[PDB]
């Protein structure tokens, strides 16, 4: 119940799951989707295909709000990242720009043992 017509698309990619939040120009979310929003449950959410489906689902739900153009922000390094971007590429949405916003520390906090030896 908005008719935004232009906005942002945040792709958050993990080895475990990919999740896509589509927002307005001020960053307020409109719709969102993920591997588990679709049928997928287990490790399969981490799959590129699941990211494709999540991206398309998010875009469709977004075009229900009557949206046309998006700026894509990409955070995280994992499978299905580039697939999510590639699905949004032509989802029926015009992608105006792509940007990698993935957060990295200046070495503030000690990682869990699994992630140690690299910082």
């Amino acid at each position: 119940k908005r008719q935004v017509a232009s906005g942002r698309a945040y792709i958050h990619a993990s080895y475990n799951n990919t999740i896509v939040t589509i927002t307005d120009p001020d960053g307020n979310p409109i719709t969102w989707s993920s591997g588990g929003v679709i049928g997928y449950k287990g490790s399969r959410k981490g799959t590129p295909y699941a990211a494709q489906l999540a991206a398309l689902d998010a875009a469709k739900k977004a075009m229900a709000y009557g949206m046309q153009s998006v700026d894509v922000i990409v955070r995280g390094t994992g499978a299905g990242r580039e697939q999510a971007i590639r699905a949004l590429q032509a989802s029926g949405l015009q992608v105006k720009s792509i940007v990698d916003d993935t957060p990295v520390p200046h070495n503030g906090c000690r990682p869990k043992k699994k992630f140690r030896k690299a910082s």
Binding site: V74, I85, S97, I98, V99, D100, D101, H106
Partner: protein, 73 residues
């Protein structure tokens, strides 16, 4: 690699110890706010060592970024 071009080869006479000069300094940073390796800057150990400190000073003053968003991709 990095045989494309170098930054020291581009500019003319300039002060390395001047932290208020943005026009010069911002050429030593990448697409992100990262300070370029010597294989890029073309500088030398001493020169580089000074450049780093002056760039950090400029960052604290608010003239230079600590980090930038990566475009394209």
């Amino acid at each position: 690699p990095s045989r494309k071009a170098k930054v020291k080869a581009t500019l003319g006479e300039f002060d390395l110890r001047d932290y208020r000069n943005v026009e010069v300094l911002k050429r030593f940073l990448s697409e992100t706010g990262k300070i370029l390796p010597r294989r890029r800057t073309g500088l030398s150990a001493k020169e580089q060592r000074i450049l780093a400190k002056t760039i950090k000073r400029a960052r604290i003053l608010g003239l230079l970024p600590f980090t930038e968003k990566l475009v394209r991709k």
